[PDB]
Design an enzyme around this catalytic site. Structure first.
Site, PDB file in Angstrom:
ATOM      1  N   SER A 137     -28.186 -55.045 -72.596  1.00  0.00           N
ATOM      2  CA  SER A 137     -27.129 -54.121 -72.270  1.00  0.00           C
ATOM      3  C   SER A 137     -27.543 -52.699 -71.945  1.00  0.00           C
ATOM      4  O   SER A 137     -26.723 -51.938 -71.424  1.00  0.00           O
ATOM      5  CB  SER A 137     -26.072 -54.083 -73.386  1.00  0.00           C
ATOM      6  OG  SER A 137     -25.407 -55.363 -73.352  1.00  0.00           O
TER       7      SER A 137
ATOM      8  N   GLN B  37     -17.898 -61.820 -72.887  1.00  0.00           N
ATOM      9  CA  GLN B  37     -18.710 -62.578 -71.950  1.00  0.00           C
ATOM     10  C   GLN B  37     -17.901 -63.174 -70.843  1.00  0.00           C
ATOM     11  O   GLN B  37     -16.756 -63.592 -71.047  1.00  0.00           O
ATOM     12  CB  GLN B  37     -19.401 -63.729 -72.645  1.00  0.00           C
ATOM     13  CG  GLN B  37     -20.228 -63.347 -73.808  1.00  0.00           C
ATOM     14  CD  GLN B  37     -19.564 -63.706 -75.191  1.00  0.00           C
ATOM     15  OE1 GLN B  37     -18.345 -63.754 -75.336  1.00  0.00           O
ATOM     16  NE2 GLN B  37     -20.393 -63.872 -76.196  1.00  0.00           N
TER      17      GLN B  37
ATOM     18  N   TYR C 295     -15.656 -53.393 -76.061  1.00  0.00           N
ATOM     19  CA  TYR C 295     -16.880 -53.596 -75.323  1.00  0.00           C
ATOM     20  C   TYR C 295     -16.874 -54.966 -74.654  1.00  0.00           C
ATOM     21  O   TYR C 295     -16.515 -55.972 -75.250  1.00  0.00           O
ATOM     22  CB  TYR C 295     -18.033 -53.463 -76.296  1.00  0.00           C
ATOM     23  CG  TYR C 295     -19.372 -53.546 -75.683  1.00  0.00           C
ATOM     24  CD1 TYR C 295     -20.160 -54.659 -75.830  1.00  0.00           C
ATOM     25  CD2 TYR C 295     -19.932 -52.464 -75.025  1.00  0.00           C
ATOM     26  CE1 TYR C 295     -21.480 -54.681 -75.367  1.00  0.00           C
ATOM     27  CE2 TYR C 295     -21.234 -52.465 -74.575  1.00  0.00           C
ATOM     28  CZ  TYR C 295     -21.977 -53.567 -74.753  1.00  0.00           C
ATOM     29  OH  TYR C 295     -23.330 -53.544 -74.376  1.00  0.00           O
TER      30      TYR C 295
ATOM     31  N   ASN D   6     -18.962 -57.300 -71.338  1.00  0.00           N
ATOM     32  CA  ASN D   6     -19.770 -57.518 -70.133  1.00  0.00           C
ATOM     33  C   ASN D   6     -18.915 -57.856 -68.936  1.00  0.00           C
ATOM     34  O   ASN D   6     -19.274 -57.516 -67.819  1.00  0.00           O
ATOM     35  CB  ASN D   6     -20.759 -58.683 -70.367  1.00  0.00           C
ATOM     36  CG  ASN D   6     -21.791 -58.372 -71.389  1.00  0.00           C
ATOM     37  OD1 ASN D   6     -22.675 -57.591 -71.138  1.00  0.00           O
ATOM     38  ND2 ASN D   6     -21.681 -58.965 -72.584  1.00  0.00           N
TER      39      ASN D   6
ATOM     40  N   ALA E  32     -29.379 -55.775 -76.188  1.00  0.00           N
ATOM     41  CA  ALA E  32     -30.102 -56.921 -76.667  1.00  0.00           C
ATOM     42  C   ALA E  32     -29.948 -58.051 -75.666  1.00  0.00           C
ATOM     43  O   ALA E  32     -29.038 -58.078 -74.836  1.00  0.00           O
ATOM     44  CB  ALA E  32     -29.636 -57.343 -78.000  1.00  0.00           C
TER      45      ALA E  32
ATOM     46  N   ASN F  41     -34.584 -59.561 -81.034  1.00  0.00           N
ATOM     47  CA  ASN F  41     -33.323 -58.904 -81.278  1.00  0.00           C
ATOM     48  C   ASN F  41     -33.304 -58.657 -82.796  1.00  0.00           C
ATOM     49  O   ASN F  41     -33.608 -59.534 -83.621  1.00  0.00           O
ATOM     50  CB  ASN F  41     -32.177 -59.796 -80.750  1.00  0.00           C
ATOM     51  CG  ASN F  41     -30.814 -59.188 -80.857  1.00  0.00           C
ATOM     52  OD1 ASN F  41     -30.702 -57.977 -81.127  1.00  0.00           O
ATOM     53  ND2 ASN F  41     -29.801 -59.947 -80.560  1.00  0.00           N
TER      54      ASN F  41
HETATM   55  O1  LIG Z   1     -26.056 -62.890 -73.146  1.00  0.00           O
HETATM   56  C1  LIG Z   1     -25.716 -61.815 -72.293  1.00  0.00           C
HETATM   57  C2  LIG Z   1     -25.464 -60.561 -73.073  1.00  0.00           C
HETATM   58  O2  LIG Z   1     -24.335 -60.651 -73.963  1.00  0.00           O
HETATM   59  C3  LIG Z   1     -24.622 -60.054 -75.208  1.00  0.00           C
HETATM   60  C4  LIG Z   1     -23.460 -59.245 -75.703  1.00  0.00           C
HETATM   61  O3  LIG Z   1     -23.178 -58.185 -74.842  1.00  0.00           O
HETATM   62  O4  LIG Z   1     -24.927 -61.081 -76.171  1.00  0.00           O
HETATM   63  C5  LIG Z   1     -24.090 -62.185 -76.265  1.00  0.00           C
HETATM   64  O5  LIG Z   1     -24.780 -63.325 -75.752  1.00  0.00           O
HETATM   65  C6  LIG Z   1     -25.939 -63.785 -76.475  1.00  0.00           C
HETATM   66  C7  LIG Z   1     -26.590 -64.980 -75.766  1.00  0.00           C
HETATM   67  O6  LIG Z   1     -25.714 -66.075 -75.800  1.00  0.00           O
HETATM   68  C8  LIG Z   1     -25.513 -64.127 -77.934  1.00  0.00           C
HETATM   69  O7  LIG Z   1     -26.643 -64.570 -78.651  1.00  0.00           O
HETATM   70  C9  LIG Z   1     -24.910 -62.908 -78.567  1.00  0.00           C
HETATM   71  O8  LIG Z   1     -24.360 -63.209 -79.853  1.00  0.00           O
HETATM   72  C10 LIG Z   1     -23.754 -62.431 -77.741  1.00  0.00           C
HETATM   73  O9  LIG Z   1     -23.122 -61.308 -78.313  1.00  0.00           O
HETATM   74  C11 LIG Z   1     -25.904 -59.250 -74.947  1.00  0.00           C
HETATM   75  O10 LIG Z   1     -26.645 -59.070 -76.167  1.00  0.00           O
HETATM   76  C12 LIG Z   1     -26.621 -60.115 -73.910  1.00  0.00           C
HETATM   77  O11 LIG Z   1     -27.559 -59.399 -73.108  1.00  0.00           O
HETATM   78  C1  4MB Z   2     -21.634 -57.130 -81.989  1.00  0.00           C
HETATM   79  S1  4MB Z   2     -21.747 -57.699 -80.364  1.00  0.00           S
HETATM   80  O1  4MB Z   2     -22.758 -58.732 -80.278  1.00  0.00           O
HETATM   81  O2  4MB Z   2     -20.421 -58.066 -79.984  1.00  0.00           O
HETATM   82  N1  4MB Z   2     -22.272 -56.470 -79.479  1.00  0.00           N
HETATM   83  C2  4MB Z   2     -21.629 -55.252 -79.297  1.00  0.00           C
HETATM   84  C3  4MB Z   2     -20.265 -55.113 -79.579  1.00  0.00           C
HETATM   85  C4  4MB Z   2     -19.663 -53.875 -79.414  1.00  0.00           C
HETATM   86  C5  4MB Z   2     -20.403 -52.788 -78.893  1.00  0.00           C
HETATM   87  C6  4MB Z   2     -19.683 -51.505 -78.699  1.00  0.00           C
HETATM   88  O3  4MB Z   2     -20.248 -50.618 -77.983  1.00  0.00           O
HETATM   89  O4  4MB Z   2     -18.542 -51.316 -79.202  1.00  0.00           O
HETATM   90  C7  4MB Z   2     -21.708 -52.978 -78.571  1.00  0.00           C
HETATM   91  C8  4MB Z   2     -22.335 -54.196 -78.806  1.00  0.00           C
END
Ligand SMILES: OC[C@H]1O[C@@](CO)(O[C@H]2O[C@H](CO)[C@@H](O)[C@H](O)[C@H]2O)[C@@H](O)[C@@H]1O
Ligand code: 4MB
Ligand code: 4MB
Ligand code: 4MB
Length: 358
Positions: free
Chosen positions: A61, A117, A147, A149, A315, A340
């Site tokens: 991210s 996602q 938050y 994606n 991550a 991570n």
């Molecule tokens: O996988 C893409 C991207 O999504 C994030 C959250 O923004 O992680 C999600 O996807 C991961 C892979 O499946 C999960 O392990 C994680 O729990 C989930 O939040 C980013 O960390 C990642 O780059």
């Molecule tokens: C815990 S998660 O894997 O959902 N990842 C997140 C969730 C929220 C934010 C935020 O900026 O609020 C950033 C990362």
């Protein structure tokens, strides 16, 4: 390197690595504008390849900062406006919940609860349209930050449409090349594989999986040197010769919304400096939970504030990254790891280092 930087970095990061069982790490500190690099451990455990200043890490991210700046550059070029409805750029998005959702909302996670996602089952452009048409908002636009994606990822895709370029091609030509980020990639070329660290999850070597809107939300890979140069560029945008890119950097650090002590930019997030790091380590903004938080609109957005802690965490399944910088102090840090590990630990280490040096 200055001994004070050497000492605070080694003394902070060595125990972090031990505690978190991180296989490999690279750190850059930007001090009075100049970078200093540190590496530990392994990019590939089985092949005994060390982390070097040329090792590529998945930014996860932290990629959103590039997306935000690219979007900023498109605004500066006059190609898009953040106040434009989403439907201006995607007229096929005819479902009524889209009324009133602007590019700003997409870029800042304020569209009304877009999902974290894009589902893995979304494989085509028709699937992507269906996904957004079928999404039911939780809230009115401009009321809560959640938050996502799928929010900033869509912003990135739409932002490049007037350019006539793919997202990747726009990023390369408009951001990476002018800034001389020559070892930063959306897709790692075969020639660079030797430098591409493995990520480690449950002791297994992993790389990020393809997915819809990956490039836009989480798909950049870079070296510690390029990331230090990215920090330098964001610290001191007036040194950038390309005027739309300079302006774009500035737009990404503007303050659009406030929740608690944090301000949402385009990709970047900001706190006023001096910072009390409790909120970002232990409290509401520590990123452990996915939190729905009411926002206050900053009308109009505050231009990039020099006395800010500007940061982004990221991550992937196998990597953990963090960037923070303080423009007024010409100071910043990049931490790239191939595991991570929890966000609070990242922020605590960054704070320890930068607070010592400021
Ligand atoms: O996988 C893409 C991207 O999504 C994030 C959250 O923004 O992680 C999600 O996807 C991961 C892979 O499946 C999960 O392990 C994680 O729990 C989930 O939040 C980013 O960390 C990642 O780059
Ligand atoms: C815990 S998660 O894997 O959902 N990842 C997140 C969730 C929220 C934010 C935020 O900026 O609020 C950033 C990362
Ligand atoms: C940050 S801004 O200057 O664009 N001002 C805004 C933006 C959005 C809203 C909203 O209600 O959606 C209100 C005010
Ligand atoms: C032009 S701006 O970006 O500041 N956005 C604004 C300003 C004021 C109001 C209002 O209702 O007063 C709403 C939105």
């Amino acid at each position: 390197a200055p001994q004070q930087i050497n000492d605070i970095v080694h003394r902070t990061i060595t125990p972090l690595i031990e505690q978190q069982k991180i296989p490999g790490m690279a750190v850059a500190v930007i001090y009075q504008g100049k970078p200093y690099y540190f590496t530990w451990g392994y990019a590939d455990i089985a092949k005994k390849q060390p982390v070097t200043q040329q090792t590529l890490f998945e930014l996860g991210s932290v990629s959103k900062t590039f997306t935000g700046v690219l979007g900023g550059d498109a605004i500066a070029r006059g190609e898009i406006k953040l106040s434009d409805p989403t439907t201006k750029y995607w007229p096929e998005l005819t479902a009524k919940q889209w009324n009133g959702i602007t590019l700003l909302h997409l870029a800042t996670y304020t569209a009304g609860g877009l999902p974290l996602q894009v589902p893995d089952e979304v494989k085509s452009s028709s699937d992507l349209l269906r996904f957004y048409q079928n999404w039911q908002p939780a809230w009115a636009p401009g009321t809560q930050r959640l938050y996502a994606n799928s929010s900033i990822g869509l912003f990135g895709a739409l932002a490049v449409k007037p350019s006539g370029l793919s997202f990747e091609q726009a990023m390369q030509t408009r951001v990476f090349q002018p800034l001389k980020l020559n070892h930063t990639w959306i897709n790692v070329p075969p020639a660079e594989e030797k430098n591409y660290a493995w990520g480690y999850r449950e002791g297994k070597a992993v790389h990020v999986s393809p997915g819809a809107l990956d490039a836009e939300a989480y798909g950049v890979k870079s070296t510690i040197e390029d990331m230090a140069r990215w920090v330098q560029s964001n610290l001191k945008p007036l040194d950038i010769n390309e005027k739309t890119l300079q302006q774009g950097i500035q737009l990404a650090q503007s303050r659009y919304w406030q929740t608690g002590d944090m301000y949402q930019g385009l990709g970047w997030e900001m706190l006023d400096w001096p910072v009390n790091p409790d909120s970002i380590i232990n409290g509401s903004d520590n990123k452990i939970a996915l939190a729905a938080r009411p926002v206050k609109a900053i009308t109009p957005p505050t231009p990039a504030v020099r006395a800010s802690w500007v940061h982004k965490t990221g991550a992937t399944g196998g990597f953990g990254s963090y960037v923070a910088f303080i423009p007024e102090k010409e100071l910043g840090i990049v931490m790239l790891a191939n595991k991570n590990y929890p966000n609070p630990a990242r922020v605590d280490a960054a704070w320890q280092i930068l607070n010592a040096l400021q």
